Design a protein around this motif. Structure first.
Motif, PDB file in Angstrom:
ATOM      1  N   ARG A  45       0.866  -1.169   0.000  1.00  0.00           N
ATOM      2  CA  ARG A  45       0.000   0.000   0.000  1.00  0.00           C
ATOM      3  C   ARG A  45       0.897   1.211   0.000  1.00  0.00           C
ATOM      4  NH1 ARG A  45      -4.472  -2.263   3.562  1.00  0.00           N
ATOM      5  NH2 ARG A  45      -5.142  -3.953   2.169  1.00  0.00           N
ATOM      6  N   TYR A  54      -3.448   3.933  -2.033  1.00  0.00           N
ATOM      7  CA  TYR A  54      -3.478   3.035  -3.192  1.00  0.00           C
ATOM      8  C   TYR A  54      -3.052   1.634  -2.751  1.00  0.00           C
ATOM      9  CZ  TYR A  54      -3.156   2.730  -8.378  1.00  0.00           C
ATOM     10  OH  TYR A  54      -3.369   2.493  -9.710  1.00  0.00           O
ATOM     11  N   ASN A  55      -3.721   0.611  -3.299  1.00  0.00           N
ATOM     12  CA  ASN A  55      -3.369  -0.780  -3.016  1.00  0.00           C
ATOM     13  C   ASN A  55      -2.763  -1.334  -4.291  1.00  0.00           C
ATOM     14  OD1 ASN A  55      -3.980  -3.389  -1.238  1.00  0.00           O
ATOM     15  ND2 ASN A  55      -4.292  -3.870  -3.383  1.00  0.00           N
ATOM     16  N   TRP A  57      -5.504  -0.515  -7.218  1.00  0.00           N
ATOM     17  CA  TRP A  57      -6.745   0.245  -7.106  1.00  0.00           C
ATOM     18  C   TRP A  57      -6.671   1.258  -5.994  1.00  0.00           C
ATOM     19  CZ3 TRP A  57      -6.758  -5.186  -6.713  1.00  0.00           C
ATOM     20  CH2 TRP A  57      -6.786  -5.703  -5.422  1.00  0.00           C
ATOM     21  N   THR A  58      -7.520   2.301  -6.074  1.00  0.00           N
ATOM     22  CA  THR A  58      -7.535   3.309  -5.039  1.00  0.00           C
ATOM     23  C   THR A  58      -8.498   2.914  -3.927  1.00  0.00           C
ATOM     24  OG1 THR A  58      -6.956   5.109  -6.537  1.00  0.00           O
ATOM     25  CG2 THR A  58      -8.204   5.718  -4.556  1.00  0.00           C
ATOM     26  N   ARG A  59      -7.984   2.926  -2.711  1.00  0.00           N
ATOM     27  CA  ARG A  59      -8.777   2.664  -1.526  1.00  0.00           C
ATOM     28  C   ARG A  59      -9.428   3.959  -1.031  1.00  0.00           C
ATOM     29  NH1 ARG A  59      -7.844  -1.826   1.840  1.00  0.00           N
ATOM     30  NH2 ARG A  59      -7.581  -0.453   3.671  1.00  0.00           N
ATOM     31  N   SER A  84     -16.076  -3.659   0.979  1.00  0.00           N
ATOM     32  CA  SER A  84     -15.884  -2.329   0.394  1.00  0.00           C
ATOM     33  C   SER A  84     -16.927  -2.119  -0.724  1.00  0.00           C
ATOM     34  CB  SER A  84     -14.469  -2.138  -0.132  1.00  0.00           C
ATOM     35  OG  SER A  84     -14.214  -3.187  -1.057  1.00  0.00           O
ATOM     36  N   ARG A 126     -15.115   1.365   2.668  1.00  0.00           N
ATOM     37  CA  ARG A 126     -14.749   2.406   1.699  1.00  0.00           C
ATOM     38  C   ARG A 126     -15.854   2.540   0.647  1.00  0.00           C
ATOM     39  NH1 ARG A 126     -10.963  -0.789   3.043  1.00  0.00           N
ATOM     40  NH2 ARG A 126     -11.152  -1.844   1.012  1.00  0.00           N
ATOM     41  N   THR A 186     -15.152   1.541  -8.143  1.00  0.00           N
ATOM     42  CA  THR A 186     -14.853   0.550  -7.120  1.00  0.00           C
ATOM     43  C   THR A 186     -13.430   0.032  -7.192  1.00  0.00           C
ATOM     44  OG1 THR A 186     -15.451  -1.382  -8.389  1.00  0.00           O
ATOM     45  CG2 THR A 186     -17.312  -0.186  -7.341  1.00  0.00           C
ATOM     46  N   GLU A 187     -13.017  -0.716  -6.168  1.00  0.00           N
ATOM     47  CA  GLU A 187     -11.693  -1.311  -6.160  1.00  0.00           C
ATOM     48  C   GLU A 187     -11.568  -2.469  -7.169  1.00  0.00           C
ATOM     49  OE1 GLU A 187     -10.749  -1.858  -1.956  1.00  0.00           O
ATOM     50  OE2 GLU A 187     -11.271   0.241  -1.609  1.00  0.00           O
TER      51      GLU A 187
END
Ligand SMILES: CCCCCCCCCCCCCC
Ligand SMILES: CCCCCCCCCCCCCC
Ligand SMILES: CCCCCCCCCCCCCC
Ligand SMILES: CCCCCCCCCCCCCC
Ligand SMILES: CCCCCCCCCCCCCC
Ligand SMILES: CCCCCCCCCCCCCC
Ligand SMILES: CCCCCCCCCCCCCC
Ligand SMILES: CCCCCCCCCCCCCC
Ligand SMILES: CCCCCCCCCCCCCC
Ligand SMILES: CCCCCCCCCCCCCC
Ligand SMILES: CCCCCCCCCCCCCC
Ligand SMILES: [Li+]
Ligand SMILES: [Li+]
Ligand SMILES: [Li+]
Lengths: 347, 347, 347
Positions: free
Chosen positions: A38, A59-60, A74-76, A121, A128, B66-67
């Motif tokens: 992350r 970001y993950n 992807w953006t968390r 999520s 999120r 979404t993620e």
């Protein structure tokens, strides 16, 4: 975090972690390398003596698949906000739903738990979420120490195409209509806290048609939580009752669900932190002959060893109490145990 | 930008923004959460007393889906270069086409405008482009204060497969053959500037066979611009006449187009910056009975409030003057008004 | 690398490069713009007098395609580890296979060579790989300068679905069963080094059933290398014999392969570094009547000019010696020459 800039009233923290992680499980969809990292930035600008502006992006980045694999990052989180003295703060963007202000108290397992279990999520305001406008107030306008509250609104995030669409469309499991949420937490004294959260969102037409289960105009959640964090001990529990808001795997949503998480941990001075937890999600009034079914049910035992504030290692053991049945099979719910081993560098 | 490193002849600036953004529109393809962030790095190394090497990367990361959504991040810029005294600079990579050296003068709206309107990205040399080699000169070799120029070349970026392919193939709307561009700007007085830009690119066989509209061996653009930037006032206009280079929505390209943008803004000392603008793109000699058609036509009214150099908020209102007709329908051109509300943290 | 943080026992280096790169080739799958950038973070925390914790992440971001293109970024490295004085280090995550500890000696061409030629990435333990646990010992417990060894284990990375699956499944060309590797390098004289590496991995069911070529339960590699690095001259060679581990283009794996790479370079004090190399990969015992076939065969001539440690430019000429035949055609192996031109900013 690592403060990398602090000049002319603006500061930037670079933060993140690199987790060398492996899972061992008979479930081949879970078993294997799970390494990820992350990275994020937290920025804050002093506008004047009472007003501060801020922004945060998280970001993950998965690192367990090949260089030709798709959809690995992807953006968390991504939000911007303003905080004005004791009058509160307001932020908008991709951020946590206020239900997590209380359910986060049990999201402390060495590896498992959190938004991979009783909630997820992009699941209304439970974790999120896209397009949340959130007002927060700490210590009740500076008048009541430890009393915090939040008010949150989320605009519809609809279907990919058709009448129910928005620009940022997605599938039914991650859609939402217009909704709102509130939370209230009271750190009554150093170490003892009680919390409540509520959410109410409109559901979408695809949520009432595409999935096999769950029908209703609105999704609602009611949460109560308790936390003890003192004398080297951490105890927390959260109970959430939901309506048309808890996913029943790929089958749809549970018309009603009862979710419960409880955790106990001890922090040794030398760095070891054993942990024991129990998590369950019970679906009720499911259609298609399902009636009442367990969506999630496990005991977790593990430990984290903290070398310092920048390095840790852990073992976590998910003892899965679900039985294989037509519900878990048709919903794609994992019923196998899992052991995780992780080595984490943090910054 | 935030200077995060400056040692042994190398400096690095980290820059970017987090924009909590929401659009309100009857057009479901644009309505809803539009939150995104940008992050970039600008580096510069002093090789010797007169030679400097540099690099810049700019990344766009959407945070409104979404993620599990795909294709949410992309590179806007990535180039490396050398600058030598008064001899000029040379850089190569993904960078702006030199037409934007003049059309950028009107790309100052609170939210709308730019490469989402009279021109787009990967649209010959009108906006960001792959594989551009760009030579720039400031003050005409130091001989003429305020007179700048640029010369640019772009190699073919072809089809995905077949005879017209290149490694980095793409669809007809973003293809190009060999291209050349030039720009020239002159600061006539303090705060008053005039500019000209020209581009000429070969079109590909897919551009001359797949789309419904536009046929020609070459894409060509001619631009004139004017800017006034003094006394807290900003006024700018650009007129561009194009041949086989302006997209006619999804239908192909306009054989000829006339694009015009004009903007006026005022900066109050307390931070408010109102803005009014008019943008139009008029297609001419369109095939299939379309004849002359408006591709874009709107008035823009908005304002940005700057709290300081790191935080701002804005409202922007696109008053869409297009009428619903067979051209806008078949080309997928939005005819609806849009209101944007944004809250931005910048670094 | 650029140290951007160093406080309270933790330090962070930001590193990377922006490479404005263009290829010229009759092979349309490689011809054209190839601009890309890399960005990474290297962190290290001092846990105690002897023990340090560390993490490293390296990301590749292509910048040669449009903003609407897919799969343009990926993680090259992501691992976390612990180092204990001179006793050695242990790290886990996505990292290089230990065979590269020796084959890296010829991975020094201006542009070509490396994991795009006799071996690839996610190709057992020959280059970057998911889920590697690696023990390393430097300078023989600090007693012998240049005598380095490594021991490595890799868990299975299986199919996308079915009995052979893991969570992080991929196609047969990038799968692996459980594997081990070891390497040992050392100096014989000042500037003269020798190296050996061995790897052994289980193969997967899909590797033995989907592609036409290569059958065996185990993939093995044996490598020997030599390097001369003194008096401004760099000479290196590597010879690797493989079993069921070298890709035969898209057709599968070679039952046996013999790979050989040799390079000679000279470093002028003013910055110019010409380079000449020869690379070949000979496949043996291929099924379907192929028998013995050249998989790769070329002479490489090029030069890099280093302006300083942060800026360089280069030209590289791949003089492809492969003949066009049914094997190269059916396996999708390029027989064309390639010229690369690059301008690189590094941090
Ligand atoms: C910047 C703040 C944007 C606020 C958006 C509110 C959402 C309303 C949707 C109905
Ligand atoms: C009292 C707190 C007990 C914590 C138990 C953890 C054991 C794994
Ligand atoms: C003083 C020696 C430096 C010579 C200049 C190097 C050549 C590259 C300059 C290109 C700028 C355009
Ligand atoms: C330095 C060489 C660059 C490539 C030259 C391209 C010339 C294009 C203009 C003439 C086109 C003639 C009709 C195809
Ligand atoms: C090298 C400069 C010439 C390149 C021109 C490319 C565009 C040609 C259009 C046809 C004339
Ligand atoms: C020398 C001081 C000049 C004052 C600048 C403010 C002028 C505002 C201009 C509005 C005019 C609009 C036409
Ligand atoms: C202050 C000047 C604003 C101009 C607004 C234009 C209004 C919209 C006209 C078309 C309807
Ligand atoms: C000067 C800024 C004015 C823009 C405000 C937006 C108006 C909203 C209209 C919605 C109908
Ligand atoms: C954190 C280190 C984990 C190492 C895992 C090794 C994989 C074992 C596969 C059987
Ligand atoms: C810790 C000891 C490492 C020893 C490595 C042995 C590697 C075998 C190399 C054989 C080279 C043969 C080339 C054909
Ligand atoms: C200096 C190297 C940068 C790449 C140059 C590309 C040449 C233009 C494409 C034909
Ligand atoms: Li219901
Ligand atoms: Li079970
Ligand atoms: Li035309």
């Amino acid at each position: 975090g690592a403060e990398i800039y602090n000049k002319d009233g603006n500061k930037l923290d670079l933060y993140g972690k690199i987790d060398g992680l492996h899972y061992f499980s008979d479930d081949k969809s879970v078993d294997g390398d799970q390494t990820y990292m992350r990275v994020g930035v937290k920025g804050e600008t002093q506008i004047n003596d009472q007003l501060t502006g801020y922004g945060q992006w998280e970001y993950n980045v998965q690192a367990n698949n090949t260089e030709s694999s798709s959809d690995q990052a992807w953006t968390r989180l991504a939000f911007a906000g303003l905080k004005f003295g004791d009058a509160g703060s307001f932020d908008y963007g991709r951020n946590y739903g206020v239900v997590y202000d209380v359910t986060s108290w049990t999201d402390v397992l060495p590896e498992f738990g959190g938004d991979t279990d009783t909630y997820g999520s992009d699941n209304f305001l439970q974790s999120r979420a896209n397009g949340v406008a959130t007002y927060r107030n700490s210590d009740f306008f500076g008048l009541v120490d430890g009393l915090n509250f939040a008010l949150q609104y989320q605009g519809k995030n609809g279907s990919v195409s058709g009448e129910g669409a928005t620009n940022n469309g997605r599938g039914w499991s991650k859609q939402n209509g217009d909704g709102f949420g509130t939370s209230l937490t009271y750190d009554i004294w150093d170490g003892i806290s009680a919390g409540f959260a509520y959410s109410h969102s409109k559901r979408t037409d695809e949520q009432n048609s595409v999935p096999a289960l769950g029908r209703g105009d609105n999704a609602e959640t009611y949460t109560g939580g308790l936390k003890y964090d003192a004398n080297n001990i951490y105890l927390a529990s959260q109970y959430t009752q939901t309506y048309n808001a808890t996913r029943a795997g790929s089958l749809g949503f549970a018309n009603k669900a009862q979710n419960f998480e409880v955790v106990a941990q001890y922090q040794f001075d030398f760095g070891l932190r054993p942990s024991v937890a129990y998590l369950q999600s019970k679906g009720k009034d499911l259609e298609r002959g399902y009636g009442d079914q367990d969506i999630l049910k496990y005991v977790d035992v593990g430990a984290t060893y903290y070398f310092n504030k920048n390095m840790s290692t852990y073992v976590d053991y998910k003892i899965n109490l679900l039985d294989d049945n037509s519900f878990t099979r048709n919903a794609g719910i994992s019923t196998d145990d899992v052991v995780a081993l992780g080595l984490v560098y943090q910054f």
